[PDB]
Coordinates of C-alpha atoms in Angstrom, one line a residue:
Chain A
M1 CA 13.0 -19.9 4.7
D2 CA 16.4 -18.2 4.4
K3 CA 17.1 -14.5 5.3
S4 CA 17.0 -13.2 1.7
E5 CA 13.6 -14.9 1.2
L6 CA 12.2 -13.8 4.6
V7 CA 13.1 -10.2 3.7
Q8 CA 11.5 -10.5 0.3
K9 CA 8.3 -11.8 2.0
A10 CA 8.4 -8.9 4.5
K11 CA 8.6 -6.4 1.6
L12 CA 5.7 -8.1 -0.2
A13 CA 3.6 -8.2 3.0
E14 CA 4.3 -4.5 3.6
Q15 CA 3.0 -3.7 0.1
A16 CA -0.1 -5.8 0.8
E17 CA -0.7 -4.2 4.2
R18 CA -0.5 -7.6 5.8
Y19 CA 1.5 -6.5 8.9
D20 CA 1.2 -9.8 10.8
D21 CA 2.9 -11.6 7.9
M22 CA 5.5 -8.8 7.8
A23 CA 6.2 -9.0 11.5
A24 CA 6.4 -12.8 11.4
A25 CA 9.0 -12.7 8.7
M26 CA 11.2 -10.0 10.3
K27 CA 10.9 -11.8 13.7
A28 CA 12.3 -15.0 12.0
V29 CA 15.1 -12.9 10.4
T30 CA 16.0 -11.5 13.8
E31 CA 15.9 -14.9 15.5
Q32 CA 18.5 -16.1 13.0
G33 CA 20.9 -14.2 15.4
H34 CA 22.9 -11.9 13.1
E35 CA 23.0 -8.1 13.3
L36 CA 20.3 -6.5 11.2
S37 CA 21.1 -4.3 8.2
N38 CA 19.5 -0.8 8.3
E39 CA 16.9 -2.0 5.8
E40 CA 16.1 -5.1 7.9
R41 CA 15.9 -2.9 11.0
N42 CA 13.4 -0.5 9.4
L43 CA 11.3 -3.4 8.1
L44 CA 11.1 -4.9 11.6
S45 CA 10.3 -1.5 13.1
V46 CA 7.5 -0.7 10.6
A47 CA 6.0 -4.2 10.9
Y48 CA 5.6 -4.1 14.7
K49 CA 4.6 -0.4 14.7
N50 CA 1.6 -1.3 12.6
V51 CA 0.8 -4.5 14.5
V52 CA 0.9 -2.7 17.9
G53 CA -0.7 0.5 16.6
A54 CA -3.9 -1.2 15.5
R55 CA -4.4 -2.4 19.1
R56 CA -3.5 1.0 20.6
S57 CA -6.1 2.6 18.4
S58 CA -8.8 0.0 19.1
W59 CA -8.0 0.3 22.9
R60 CA -8.5 4.0 22.8
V61 CA -11.8 3.6 21.0
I62 CA -13.2 0.9 23.3
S63 CA -12.0 2.8 26.5
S64 CA -13.7 6.0 25.2
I65 CA -17.0 4.1 24.5
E66 CA -16.8 2.4 27.9
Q67 CA -16.3 5.6 29.8
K68 CA -19.3 7.3 28.1
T69 CA -21.6 4.3 28.8
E70 CA -22.7 4.7 32.4
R71 CA -26.4 3.9 31.6
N72 CA -26.3 0.1 31.2
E73 CA -24.5 -2.4 33.4
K74 CA -24.5 -5.3 30.8
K75 CA -23.0 -3.2 28.0
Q76 CA -20.5 -1.7 30.4
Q77 CA -19.3 -5.2 31.4
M78 CA -19.1 -6.2 27.7
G79 CA -17.0 -3.1 27.0
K80 CA -14.7 -4.0 29.9
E81 CA -14.2 -7.6 28.7
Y82 CA -13.5 -6.4 25.1
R83 CA -11.0 -3.8 26.4
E84 CA -9.2 -6.5 28.4
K85 CA -9.0 -8.8 25.3
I86 CA -7.4 -6.0 23.4
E87 CA -5.0 -5.3 26.3
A88 CA -3.9 -8.9 26.4
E89 CA -3.1 -8.8 22.6
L90 CA -1.2 -5.5 23.1
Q91 CA 0.8 -7.0 26.0
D92 CA 1.7 -10.1 23.9
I93 CA 2.9 -7.9 21.1
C94 CA 5.0 -5.7 23.3
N95 CA 6.5 -8.6 25.2
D96 CA 7.4 -10.3 21.8
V97 CA 9.2 -7.1 20.7
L98 CA 10.9 -6.6 24.1
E99 CA 12.2 -10.2 24.0
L100 CA 13.6 -9.6 20.5
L101 CA 15.3 -6.4 21.7
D102 CA 16.8 -8.0 24.8
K103 CA 17.9 -11.3 23.3
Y104 CA 19.2 -10.3 19.9
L105 CA 19.0 -6.7 18.8
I106 CA 20.5 -4.7 21.8
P107 CA 23.3 -7.2 22.5
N108 CA 24.3 -7.5 18.9
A109 CA 24.3 -3.7 18.2
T110 CA 27.9 -2.7 17.2
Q111 CA 27.5 1.0 16.2
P112 CA 26.2 3.7 18.4
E113 CA 23.3 4.7 16.1
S114 CA 22.0 1.0 16.1
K115 CA 22.2 1.0 19.9
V116 CA 20.2 4.3 20.1
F117 CA 17.6 2.9 17.7
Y118 CA 17.1 -0.3 19.7
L119 CA 17.1 1.5 23.1
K120 CA 14.5 4.0 21.7
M121 CA 12.4 1.0 20.5
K122 CA 12.6 -0.5 24.0
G123 CA 11.4 2.9 25.4
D124 CA 8.6 2.9 22.9
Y125 CA 7.3 -0.6 23.7
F126 CA 7.5 -0.1 27.5
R127 CA 5.6 3.1 27.0
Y128 CA 2.9 1.1 25.1
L129 CA 2.8 -1.4 27.9
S130 CA 2.5 1.4 30.5
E131 CA -0.5 2.8 28.7
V132 CA -2.6 -0.2 29.7
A133 CA -0.8 -1.2 32.9
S134 CA -2.2 -0.8 36.4
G135 CA -0.9 -0.8 39.9
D136 CA 2.8 -1.4 40.7
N137 CA 3.2 -2.9 37.2
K138 CA 2.4 0.5 35.7
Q139 CA 5.1 2.1 37.9
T140 CA 7.5 -0.6 36.6
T141 CA 6.8 -0.2 32.9
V142 CA 6.9 3.6 33.1
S143 CA 10.2 3.5 34.9
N144 CA 11.7 1.0 32.4
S145 CA 10.4 3.2 29.5
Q146 CA 12.2 6.3 30.9
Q147 CA 15.4 4.4 31.6
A148 CA 15.6 3.0 28.0
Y149 CA 14.9 6.5 26.5
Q150 CA 17.5 8.0 28.9
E151 CA 20.2 5.5 27.9
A152 CA 19.5 6.2 24.2
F153 CA 19.5 9.9 24.9
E154 CA 23.0 9.9 26.6
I155 CA 24.5 7.9 23.7
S156 CA 22.9 10.1 21.1
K157 CA 24.2 13.4 22.6
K158 CA 27.7 11.9 22.7
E159 CA 28.0 10.1 19.4
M160 CA 25.4 11.4 17.0
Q161 CA 25.0 14.6 15.1
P162 CA 21.9 16.6 16.2
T163 CA 20.5 16.3 12.6
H164 CA 20.7 12.5 12.5
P165 CA 17.1 11.1 12.1
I166 CA 17.6 8.5 14.8
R167 CA 18.6 11.2 17.3
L168 CA 15.7 13.4 16.2
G169 CA 13.2 10.5 16.3
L170 CA 14.4 9.6 19.8
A171 CA 13.9 13.2 21.0
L172 CA 10.4 13.2 19.4
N173 CA 9.3 10.0 21.2
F174 CA 11.0 10.9 24.5
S175 CA 9.2 14.2 24.5
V176 CA 5.9 12.4 23.8
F177 CA 6.7 10.1 26.8
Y178 CA 7.0 13.2 29.0
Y179 CA 3.8 14.8 27.7
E180 CA 1.5 11.8 27.6
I181 CA 2.9 9.4 30.2
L182 CA 4.3 11.7 32.8
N183 CA 1.9 14.7 32.2
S184 CA 4.9 17.0 32.2
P185 CA 4.2 19.4 29.3
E186 CA 7.0 21.9 30.0
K187 CA 9.7 19.2 30.1
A188 CA 8.2 17.7 27.0
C189 CA 8.3 21.0 25.2
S190 CA 11.8 21.8 26.4
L191 CA 13.1 18.4 25.1
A192 CA 11.5 18.8 21.7
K193 CA 12.5 22.4 21.4
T194 CA 16.1 21.9 22.4
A195 CA 16.4 19.0 19.9
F196 CA 14.9 21.1 17.2
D197 CA 17.2 24.1 18.0
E198 CA 20.3 21.9 18.0
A199 CA 19.4 20.5 14.6
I200 CA 18.8 24.0 13.3
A201 CA 22.2 25.2 14.7
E202 CA 24.1 22.4 13.2
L203 CA 22.9 23.7 9.7
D204 CA 25.6 26.3 9.3
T205 CA 23.8 28.7 6.9
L206 CA 20.2 28.5 8.1
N207 CA 17.9 29.7 10.9
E208 CA 14.4 28.5 11.7
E209 CA 12.5 30.7 9.2
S210 CA 15.1 30.2 6.4
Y211 CA 15.1 26.4 7.2
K212 CA 11.4 26.3 6.7
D213 CA 11.5 28.2 3.4
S214 CA 14.4 26.1 2.1
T215 CA 12.8 22.7 2.9
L216 CA 9.6 23.8 1.2
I217 CA 11.5 24.8 -1.9
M218 CA 13.5 21.6 -1.8
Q219 CA 10.2 19.6 -1.7
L220 CA 8.9 21.6 -4.7
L221 CA 12.1 20.8 -6.6
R222 CA 11.8 17.1 -5.8
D223 CA 8.1 17.2 -6.8
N224 CA 8.8 18.8 -10.1
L225 CA 11.5 16.3 -10.8
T226 CA 9.0 13.5 -10.2
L227 CA 6.4 15.1 -12.4
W228 CA 8.8 15.9 -15.3
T229 CA 10.2 12.3 -15.5
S230 CA 6.8 10.6 -16.2
Chain B
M1 CA -23.0 -15.8 24.3
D2 CA -26.6 -15.1 23.4
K3 CA -27.9 -12.9 20.5
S4 CA -27.9 -9.6 22.4
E5 CA -24.3 -10.1 23.7
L6 CA -23.0 -11.1 20.3
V7 CA -24.7 -8.2 18.6
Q8 CA -23.2 -5.7 21.2
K9 CA -19.8 -7.3 20.6
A10 CA -20.2 -6.9 16.9
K11 CA -21.0 -3.2 17.3
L12 CA -18.0 -2.7 19.6
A13 CA -15.7 -4.5 17.1
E14 CA -17.0 -2.3 14.3
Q15 CA -16.1 0.8 16.3
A16 CA -12.7 -0.7 17.0
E17 CA -12.2 -1.6 13.3
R18 CA -11.6 -5.3 14.4
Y19 CA -13.6 -6.8 11.5
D20 CA -12.5 -10.4 12.1
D21 CA -14.1 -10.2 15.5
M22 CA -17.2 -8.5 14.1
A23 CA -17.6 -11.2 11.4
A24 CA -17.1 -14.0 14.0
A25 CA -19.8 -12.4 16.2
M26 CA -22.3 -12.1 13.4
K27 CA -21.6 -15.6 12.1
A28 CA -22.5 -16.9 15.5
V29 CA -25.7 -14.9 15.5
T30 CA -26.6 -16.3 12.1
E31 CA -25.9 -19.8 13.1
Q32 CA -28.4 -19.4 15.9
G33 CA -30.9 -19.8 13.1
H34 CA -33.3 -16.9 13.7
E35 CA -34.2 -14.4 11.0
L36 CA -32.0 -11.3 11.3
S37 CA -33.4 -7.9 12.0
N38 CA -32.4 -5.1 9.5
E39 CA -29.7 -4.0 11.9
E40 CA -28.2 -7.5 12.3
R41 CA -28.4 -8.0 8.6
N42 CA -26.4 -4.8 8.1
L43 CA -23.8 -5.7 10.8
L44 CA -23.2 -9.1 9.1
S45 CA -22.9 -7.5 5.7
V46 CA -20.5 -4.8 6.8
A47 CA -18.3 -7.2 8.7
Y48 CA -17.8 -9.6 5.9
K49 CA -17.5 -6.7 3.4
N50 CA -14.5 -5.5 5.3
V51 CA -13.0 -8.9 6.0
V52 CA -13.1 -10.0 2.3
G53 CA -12.3 -6.5 1.0
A54 CA -8.9 -6.5 2.8
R55 CA -8.0 -9.7 0.9
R56 CA -9.3 -8.4 -2.4
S57 CA -7.1 -5.3 -1.9
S58 CA -4.0 -7.4 -1.0
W59 CA -4.6 -9.7 -4.0
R60 CA -4.7 -6.7 -6.3
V61 CA -1.4 -5.3 -5.0
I62 CA 0.4 -8.7 -5.1
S63 CA -0.9 -9.5 -8.6
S64 CA 0.3 -6.1 -9.8
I65 CA 3.7 -6.6 -8.3
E66 CA 3.9 -10.2 -9.6
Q67 CA 3.3 -9.2 -13.2
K68 CA 5.5 -6.1 -13.0
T69 CA 8.5 -8.2 -11.8
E70 CA 10.7 -7.9 -14.9
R71 CA 13.8 -10.1 -14.4
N72 CA 14.0 -11.9 -11.0
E73 CA 12.7 -15.4 -11.0
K74 CA 13.0 -16.0 -7.2
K75 CA 11.0 -12.9 -6.5
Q76 CA 8.4 -13.8 -9.1
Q77 CA 7.9 -17.3 -7.6
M78 CA 7.6 -15.8 -4.1
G79 CA 5.0 -13.3 -5.3
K80 CA 3.1 -16.1 -7.0
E81 CA 3.1 -18.2 -3.8
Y82 CA 2.0 -15.2 -1.7
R83 CA -0.8 -14.4 -4.1
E84 CA -2.0 -18.1 -3.9
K85 CA -1.9 -17.8 0.0
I86 CA -4.1 -14.7 -0.2
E87 CA -6.4 -16.4 -2.8
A88 CA -6.9 -19.4 -0.4
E89 CA -7.9 -17.0 2.4
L90 CA -10.3 -15.1 0.2
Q91 CA -11.9 -18.4 -1.0
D92 CA -12.3 -19.6 2.7
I93 CA -14.0 -16.3 3.5
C94 CA -16.4 -16.4 0.6
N95 CA -17.3 -20.1 1.1
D96 CA -18.1 -19.2 4.8
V97 CA -20.5 -16.5 3.7
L98 CA -22.0 -18.6 1.0
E99 CA -22.6 -21.4 3.5
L100 CA -24.3 -19.0 5.9
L101 CA -26.5 -17.7 3.1
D102 CA -27.4 -21.2 1.8
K103 CA -28.0 -22.9 5.1
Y104 CA -29.6 -20.1 7.3
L105 CA -30.2 -16.7 5.7
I106 CA -31.9 -17.4 2.3
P107 CA -34.2 -20.4 3.4
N108 CA -35.3 -18.5 6.6
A109 CA -36.2 -15.2 4.9
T110 CA -40.0 -14.7 5.3
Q111 CA -40.0 -11.2 3.7
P112 CA -39.0 -10.5 0.1
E113 CA -36.8 -7.6 1.1
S114 CA -34.6 -9.8 3.2
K115 CA -34.6 -12.5 0.5
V116 CA -33.5 -10.0 -2.1
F117 CA -30.7 -8.7 0.2
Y118 CA -29.4 -12.2 0.8
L119 CA -29.5 -13.2 -2.9
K120 CA -27.6 -10.1 -3.7
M121 CA -25.0 -11.0 -1.2
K122 CA -24.9 -14.5 -2.8
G123 CA -24.2 -12.8 -6.1
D124 CA -21.5 -10.6 -4.5
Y125 CA -19.5 -13.4 -2.9
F126 CA -19.7 -15.7 -6.0
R127 CA -18.4 -12.6 -7.9
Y128 CA -15.5 -12.3 -5.4
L129 CA -14.7 -16.1 -5.9
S130 CA -14.8 -15.6 -9.7
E131 CA -12.2 -12.9 -9.5
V132 CA -9.6 -15.4 -8.3
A133 CA -11.0 -18.7 -9.7
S134 CA -8.8 -21.0 -11.7
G135 CA -9.9 -23.4 -14.5
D136 CA -13.4 -24.9 -14.5
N137 CA -14.4 -23.0 -11.3
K138 CA -14.3 -19.7 -13.2
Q139 CA -17.2 -20.5 -15.5
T140 CA -19.1 -22.0 -12.5
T141 CA -18.6 -19.1 -10.2
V142 CA -19.5 -16.4 -12.7
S143 CA -22.6 -18.4 -13.6
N144 CA -23.6 -18.8 -10.0
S145 CA -23.1 -15.1 -9.4
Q146 CA -25.3 -14.2 -12.3
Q147 CA -28.1 -16.6 -11.3
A148 CA -28.1 -15.3 -7.8
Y149 CA -28.3 -11.6 -8.8
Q150 CA -31.0 -12.6 -11.3
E151 CA -33.1 -14.3 -8.7
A152 CA -32.8 -11.3 -6.5
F153 CA -33.9 -9.2 -9.4
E154 CA -37.0 -11.4 -10.1
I155 CA -38.2 -11.0 -6.6
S156 CA -37.4 -7.3 -6.3
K157 CA -39.1 -6.2 -9.5
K158 CA -42.2 -8.0 -8.3
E159 CA -42.2 -7.0 -4.6
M160 CA -40.5 -3.6 -4.1
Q161 CA -40.8 -0.1 -5.3
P162 CA -38.0 1.3 -7.6
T163 CA -37.1 3.7 -4.8
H164 CA -36.5 1.0 -2.2
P165 CA -32.9 1.0 -1.0
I166 CA -32.4 -2.8 -1.3
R167 CA -33.7 -2.9 -4.9
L168 CA -31.5 0.0 -5.8
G169 CA -28.4 -1.6 -4.2
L170 CA -29.1 -4.8 -6.1
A171 CA -29.2 -2.8 -9.3
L172 CA -25.8 -1.2 -8.3
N173 CA -24.0 -4.4 -7.6
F174 CA -25.6 -6.3 -10.5
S175 CA -24.6 -3.5 -13.0
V176 CA -21.1 -3.6 -11.5
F177 CA -21.1 -7.4 -12.1
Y178 CA -22.0 -6.8 -15.7
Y179 CA -19.3 -4.1 -16.1
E180 CA -16.4 -5.8 -14.3
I181 CA -17.0 -9.5 -14.5
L182 CA -18.8 -9.9 -17.9
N183 CA -17.0 -6.8 -19.4
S184 CA -20.5 -5.8 -20.7
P185 CA -20.7 -2.0 -20.5
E186 CA -24.0 -2.0 -22.5
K187 CA -25.9 -4.2 -20.0
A188 CA -24.3 -2.5 -17.1
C189 CA -25.3 1.0 -18.3
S190 CA -28.8 -0.3 -19.2
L191 CA -29.4 -1.8 -15.8
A192 CA -28.1 1.2 -13.9
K193 CA -29.9 3.8 -16.0
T194 CA -33.1 1.9 -15.9
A195 CA -32.9 1.7 -12.1
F196 CA -32.0 5.3 -11.7
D197 CA -34.8 6.5 -14.0
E198 CA -37.4 4.3 -12.5
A199 CA -36.5 5.7 -9.2
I200 CA -36.7 9.3 -10.5
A201 CA -40.2 8.3 -11.6
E202 CA -41.0 7.4 -8.0
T203 CA -42.5 6.6 -0.5
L204 CA -39.8 6.4 2.1
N205 CA -38.6 7.4 5.6
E206 CA -35.5 9.4 6.7
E207 CA -33.0 6.5 7.0
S208 CA -34.3 4.8 3.7
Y209 CA -34.3 8.3 2.0
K210 CA -30.6 8.6 3.0
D211 CA -29.7 5.1 1.8
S212 CA -31.6 5.4 -1.5
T213 CA -30.1 8.9 -2.3
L214 CA -26.6 7.6 -1.7
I215 CA -27.1 4.6 -3.9
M216 CA -28.6 6.8 -6.6
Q217 CA -25.5 9.0 -6.5
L218 CA -23.4 5.9 -6.9
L219 CA -25.5 4.8 -9.9
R220 CA -25.2 8.1 -11.6
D221 CA -21.4 8.3 -11.0
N222 CA -21.0 4.8 -12.4
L223 CA -23.1 5.9 -15.4
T224 CA -20.9 8.9 -16.1
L225 CA -17.7 7.0 -15.7
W226 CA -18.9 4.1 -17.9
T227 CA -20.4 6.3 -20.7
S228 CA -17.1 8.1 -20.9
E229 CA -15.7 5.0 -22.5

């Protein structure tokens, strides 16, 4: 199809919670080789987030069951083989995304926020790979994850306002990397807390408590506006 | 794989919410041609319920969008084509299940409980077909659905107590068929109230107690909702 049609199909697939269709359409869009609009970027991101997240969840479930079954050898071997099938799917998905990032998305990014978004995405998908990697391969994927996050981080601190959602989402996912992949809870907390504090400080007339109060009331205003116009 | 390995795989896939895998495993078990245990019967039913339910949900969403599209012809045609793609998938799934029931499950049932469960499933999947059927297939699929439920009914009323969970679940799904497919609130409420009351008039174990009480609550909730209109 053409780009307009592929994007329409992705939106329909998203509504239908058919994330494989959504991912396929946005992959085709990307492979047409032009820089993605913000909307197209978000559709691609959401599609592959759901596709990969299903496998991450299934893998956690099967690993948990497999660790808590030390009574039967046959069932344990079955759980191992099923876990490995899910790991293979997860790796195919991650490699798909990383190829898209390396061949189209990162090289074609013109603005700094696009660059940060796609380098964060590379950090994310290398983190997903590292969750199921073993041996030296693990060391590699972990390292690559950190590197991508770090590159994104350096651009975001130089070129992006602390309140920009892409900078904040990067800080969120990088702190998660430190907590869950490097088992470094104090560094994770410091990254998340410094990013939060920088966003708070950029808001000229608010502190943390006043920010919380104000965002709650803003939500209530939006909710009332929704209710009253129906 | 052999039966025990396929069943273990189906249970693992259920835990992992990988229902395509679960359905493929239980389909292979069924095609081995041995009568299913109660557990295997429930695994098969749950797997295909989830597999077909995902498509029913997607179909509802895309049909809603397609008829809400005011003035964009390209988008409306794309929504139509996407709905038809989903319809084809749903029809493939239902035909798969109906073939399992016709070739293996129904003719191999040597207990009336199993036969009633499988004939109820036959009614269920012909109902799902009927929700998307076009032209002459509509009349056929609805008719097939009703006959299947009715055959299940004729066996159950003769062979099982009103409290039995399979008889109750048949009444639940058959009353839903009357309400939603035949738009017949009177026959739906009649069937559901009769099943509920005959149960109240009374013979179980713990698991069957649980199943029956849940189905009873579903019957009574349906009754309330339906008698509200």
